[PDB]
Design a protein around this ligand. Structure first.
Ligand SMILES: *[C@@H]1O[C@H](CO)[C@@H](O[C@@H]2O[C@H](CO)[C@@H](O)[C@H](O)[C@H]2NC(C)=O)[C@H](O)[C@H]1NC(C)=O
Ligand SMILES: *[C@@H]1O[C@H](CO)[C@@H](O[C@@H]2O[C@H](CO)[C@@H](O)[C@H](O)[C@H]2NC(C)=O)[C@H](O)[C@H]1NC(C)=O
Ligand SMILES: *[C@@H]1O[C@H](CO)[C@@H](O)[C@H](O)[C@H]1NC(C)=O
Ligand SMILES: *[C@@H]1O[C@H](CO)[C@@H](O)[C@H](O)[C@H]1NC(C)=O
Ligand SMILES: *[C@@H]1O[C@H](CO)[C@@H](O)[C@H](O)[C@H]1NC(C)=O
Ligand SMILES: *[C@@H]1O[C@H](CO)[C@@H](O)[C@H](O)[C@H]1NC(C)=O
Ligand SMILES: *[C@@H]1O[C@H](CO)[C@@H](O)[C@H](O)[C@H]1NC(C)=O
Ligand SMILES: *[C@@H]1O[C@H](CO)[C@@H](O)[C@H](O)[C@H]1NC(C)=O
Ligand SMILES: *[C@@H]1O[C@H](CO)[C@@H](O)[C@H](O)[C@H]1NC(C)=O
Lengths: 252, 361, 99, 120, 49, 50
């Protein structure tokens, strides 16, 4: 089942500053009281990240190029964002990856799905309209659920050697509109063996029915670039500060 | 000391002659308690395989793997392993295994190798040059040949460009071999991309069916899920042991740690990028790997004109790990420690000196 | 920065030791920097070549370390001879030498 | 601990012996340097218990009896302000004995002038 | 300017950084030597006319 | 071919740096002597013979 949403209000996408966010652990290695220089796909400091809104009438669910990695920031309350759409052509011709978090668990599937042009979920105050068919499945994985704006959700998605790395961090914030300025290293959550080509992605939202109403949420998309970071490890082994080696001569 | 100095007369002094090295007592192997056996029966003993243009890939992970049943079998004609020793397949641990099963003919089995050419290598199945894994090929004349011809096995014969490694092409588009747009209809200079093998039991071994399973092991900076059936021994700590933690081989004195690893953090590294702590695969316990008490063996002697008595200094070695006296420099054997203070005759270090009067320190 | 000279000597010695440690992580053209991985992954005819590459790389690193340690030892010996001269002439007597 | 690596290393001869001999020469050279710098007196002098030096104060440079290290306050400040086959050999003279040597030199140059450096 | 040469040179580790550090130490040592030899006074004295 | 050229040029560069370090040590010793002469002969009258 698919439904065209024709009550949207036209608005250009926003942009904002990344500050010092998007840092994640490059590996599964504990380090104590040491500075480690690493070369990997990292998010540049103070970069221009694309800002999308969900407010009422804004409902931002486009398809964006994946590039070499995706940093997803979510200023979320009441759990509007439920999952993601990963693929190349987003149809039954190729094989696509589905990440969903419903009311019980998280489901990760690599199958040939027929995606709708406008995919969404719905809460009645009972509506699933994200696909119409699923033909050839190769990988299924059912796990425990990961989940004023009250919650901040950071995610890093990487496609390296046929391995899909999902890094995540939950942060309690109380800032009304923009991203807070601070440091929070993202722990690795799950590595999925997929071995598939992914070049495009799309966020999945949920409708509110009482037509339709969009719940208040905001999210940010940043792009990962190959660079060097100098990470500081404390006595307890958490990354407390980082240096971007290609940002400015002082950090160089 | 005479052997080291290449002289028969040793002058009074201290001479570094050898290198003490604590040797490991026993071997400890700790693996996760996974007992479900890896599905190699579905890979190798399937009723029907697939054609080489549509070669079948199977993901093996999260199971204990037994490679002894593959090696001892007397049907596998080709067991060519690249990057790994075929006998040492049982020893190592990996994270993910990719099983590519297909059926080819005999003369083109040699094309399934890194760096060769041919129709299978160019248009059907290409192996990367950095391939780490094995190729297992066996004759299947009884199962894949029929009297009158078995034409259900096809190979891609025509393609515009050569394939990428680990890429498949199941498309059926009519290959134009001339300059005529013929609209996807077979005829003059328009050929079907797929051509049948046509296997018969009377055909020669160059044109006989061979089933090929290509096992690809990938080993990243990830926790290993595919391991051998090596048994996990009991945890013996505070002793110099050879150890194998989830494929992480080494030698050390494993003790109890106070480090707080995060749940994803398996092992640990120090400031000098050496592995100094691991998580126990079974009980999820952090164990510090201190290494072995290596030391310099120095011989303290007066002149051979005076006496033949010697003392041995093990530098930086505690006396419980080797007239025995403990110094900050190390363990000194053969010198009687006295409470009196004299001038330094033979320097030992850390305020310790030796002299002859017997040898005193 | 009053005691910069001693801190510089300590930092140079620690940095040289750390560099000598970090030279073990370089394969010097071999497939891996770990001897156990080479001995478990390859047959002795090719493991001999890979171990030989690691041996010549580590030997070159050790020779470089010993050479720079000898140069620093000569510099420290010159400084210590100067310090002994100052101990003899400024502390144990009154010196007429200007500055 | 690889025996095959050592067997291949034996083809290169006595390089390891030369490196060990050079490091041993450096190690004994450090002790010789400390011996030449600090051990210039064979008498361990002490200051008198009464510090009557005509108004001159040496408390900041004389050793503090209250401290277990027997160092001067200046020397204590100096010690506070300084922060795989590898072994570190300890120095022949410990920090306590070097402090004792400096204390003996200070007592000699305070109580005896330059006479102790040239004789009794 | 050959990138393949630098990619092969990275297998040998931090030899180039060591050589640059040694040459930088020599270069600052020359300025330290000139500073020690000639700059022994902080007052620029002038002769009478 | 580049491996042979790299090891040859690296050996040459290490030899050059070693020679530069030895000459720099010699020049540093000469400069310390020159500073001693500047302190003791120019800024004062020296009783040291020759
Ligand atoms: C929602 O809108 C999209 C875009 O207008 C529709 O997608 C098109 O559907 C028509 C139906 O015949 C196709 O001919 C077009 O090729 C489609 N567009 C693309 C780009 O493929 C979609 O069908 C609409 N959904 C519903 C339920 O009507
Ligand atoms: C020499 O100097 C020391 C330190 O400057 C003097 O010690 C001080 O004595 C007064 C009382 O006489 C105390 O209130 C201070 O706290 C002391 N200072 C320290 C750092 O302990 C000492 O009196 C001086 N004279 C003699 C003869 O020793
Ligand atoms: C981000 O990009 C938009 C349009 O691309 C631009 O208007 C804006 O000034 C940029 N912001 C920064 C901080 O570069
Ligand atoms: C969530 O999805 C799983 C996967 O199909 C399903 O078993 C479960 O019933 C779903 N829960 C709800 C509340 O819809
Ligand atoms: C994929 O699905 C289509 C639609 O049912 C089917 O015709 C095709 O055989 C499937 N391919 C594979 C490899 O399963
Ligand atoms: C992945 O998909 C994109 C777009 O379809 C394509 O340009 C690219 O070549 C593909 N990469 C691989 C390795 O198949
Ligand atoms: C490290 O953890 C301890 C508790 O184990 C805590 O008291 C301390 O503040 C922590 N330090 C940092 C820098 O997080
Ligand atoms: C396939 O079946 C034969 C029949 O005895 C057996 O010997 C062999 O071990 C089986 N191979 C696998 C991989 O299970
Ligand atoms: C088996 O391993 C799991 C972790 O993978 C652990 O929780 C459990 O206690 C282990 N059981 C035994 C009997 O060692």
């Amino acid at each position: 089942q698919c439904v065209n949403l024709t009550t949207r209000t036209q608005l250009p996408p926003a942009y904002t500053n990344s500050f010092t966010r998007g840092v994640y652990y490059p590996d599964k290695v504990f380090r104590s009281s040491v500075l480690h220089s690493t070369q990997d796909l990292f998010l540049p400091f103070f970069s221009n990240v694309t800002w999308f809104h969900a407010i009422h009438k804004r409902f931002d669910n486009p398809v964006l190029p994946f590039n070499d990695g995706v940093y997803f920031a979510s200023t979320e309350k009441s759990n509007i964002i439920r999952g993601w759409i990963f693929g190349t052509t987003l149809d039954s011709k190729t094989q696509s990856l589905l990440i969903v978090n419903n009311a019980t668990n998280v489901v990760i599937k690599v199958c040939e799905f027929q995606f709708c042009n406008d995919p969404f979920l719905g809460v009645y105050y009972s509506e699933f309209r994200v696909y119409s068919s699923a033909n050839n499945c190769t990988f299924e994985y059912v796990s425990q659920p990961f989940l004023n704006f009250k919650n901040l959700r950071e995610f890093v998605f990487k496609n390296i050697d046929g391995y899909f790395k999902i890094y995540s961090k939950h942060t309690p914030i109380n800032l009304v509109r923009d991203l807070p300025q601070g440091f929070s290293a993202l722990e690795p959550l799950v590595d999925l063996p997929i071995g598939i080509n992914i070049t495009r992605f799309q966020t999945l939202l949920a409708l509110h029915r009482s037509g339709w109403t969009a719940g208040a949420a905001a999210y940010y998309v940043g792009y990962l670039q190959p660079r060097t970071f100098l990470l500081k490890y404390n006595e307890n082994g958490t990354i407390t500060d980082a240096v971007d080696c290609a940002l400015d001569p002082l950090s160089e | 000391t005479k052997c080291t100095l290449k002289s028969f007369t040793v002058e009074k002094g201290i001479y570094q002659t050898s290198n003490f090295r604590v040797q490991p007592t026993e071997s400890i192997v700790r693996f996760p308690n996974i007992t479900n056996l890896c599905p190699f029966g579905e890979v190798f003993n399937a009723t029907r395989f697939a054609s080489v243009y549509a070669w079948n890939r199977k993901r093996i992970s999260n199971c204990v793997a037994d490679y002894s049943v593959l090696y001892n079998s007397a049907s596998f004609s080709t067991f060519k392993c690249y990057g790994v020793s075929p006998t040492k397949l049982n020893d190592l641990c990996f994270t993910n295994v990719y099983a590519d099963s297909f059926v080819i003919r005999g003369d083109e089995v040699r094309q399934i190798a890194p760096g060769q050419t041919g129709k299978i290598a160019d248009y059907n199945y290409k192996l990367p040059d950095d391939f780490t894994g094995c190729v297992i090929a066996w004759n299947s004349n009884n199962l894949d040949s029929k009297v009158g011809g078995n034409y259900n096995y096809r190979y891609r014969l025509f393609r515009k460009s050569n394939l990428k490694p680990f890429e498949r092409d199941i498309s059926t588009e009519i290959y134009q071999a001339g300059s005529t747009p013929c609209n996807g209809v077979i005829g003059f200079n328009c050929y079907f991309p797929l051509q049948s093998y046509g296997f018969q039991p009377t055909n020669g071994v160059g044109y006989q069916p061979y089933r090929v399973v290509v096992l690809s092991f990938e080993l990243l900076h990830a926790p290993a899920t595919v391991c051998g059936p090596k048994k996990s021994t009991n945890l013996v700590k505070n002793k110099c042991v050879n150890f194998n933690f989830n494929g992480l081989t080494g030698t050390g004195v494993l003790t109890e740690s106070n480090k707080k690893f995060l749940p994803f953090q398996q092992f640990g590294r120090d400031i000098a990028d050496t592995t100094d702590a691991v998580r126990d695969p079974q009980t999820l316990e952090i164990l510090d790997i201190t290494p072995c008490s290596f030391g310099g063996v120095s011989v303290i002697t007066p002149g051979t004109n005076t006496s033949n008595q010697v003392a041995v200094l093990y530098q930086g070695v505690n006396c419980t790990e080797v007239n025995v006296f403990q110094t900050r420099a190390g363990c000194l054997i053969g010198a009687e420690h006295v409470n009196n203070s004299y001038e330094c005759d033979i320097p030992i270090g850390a305020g310790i000196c030796a002299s002859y009067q017997s040898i005193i320190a | 920065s009053a005691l910069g000279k001693l801190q510089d000597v300590v930092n140079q010695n620690a940095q040289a030791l750390n560099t000598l440690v970090k030279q073990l992580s370089s394969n010097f053209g071999a497939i891996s920097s770990v001897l156990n991985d080479i001995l478990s992954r390859l047959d002795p005819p090719e493991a001999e070549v890979q171990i030989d590459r690691l041996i010549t790389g580590r030997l070159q690193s050790l020779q470089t370390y010993v050479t720079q340690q000898l140069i620093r030892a000569a510099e420290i010996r010159a400084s210590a001879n100067l310090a002994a001269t100052k101990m003899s002439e400024c502390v144990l007597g009154q010196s007429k030498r200007v500055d | 601990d690889s025996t095959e690596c050592s067997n291949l290393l034996l083809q290169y001869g006595s390089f390891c012996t030369q490196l060990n001999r050079a490091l041993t020469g450096i190690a004994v050279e450090q002790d010789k340097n400390t011996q030449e710098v600090f051990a210039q007196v064979k008498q361990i002098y002490k200051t008198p218990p009464i510090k009557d030096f005509g108004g001159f104060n040496f408390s900041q440079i004389l050793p503090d009896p209250s401290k277990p290290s027997k160092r001067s306050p200046i020397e204590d400040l100096l010690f506070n302000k300084v922060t795989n086959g590898l072994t570190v050999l300890p120095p022949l003279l410990t920090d306590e004995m070097i402090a004792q040597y400096t204390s003996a030199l200070l007592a000699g140059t305070i109580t005896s002038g330059w006479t102790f450096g040239a004789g009794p």
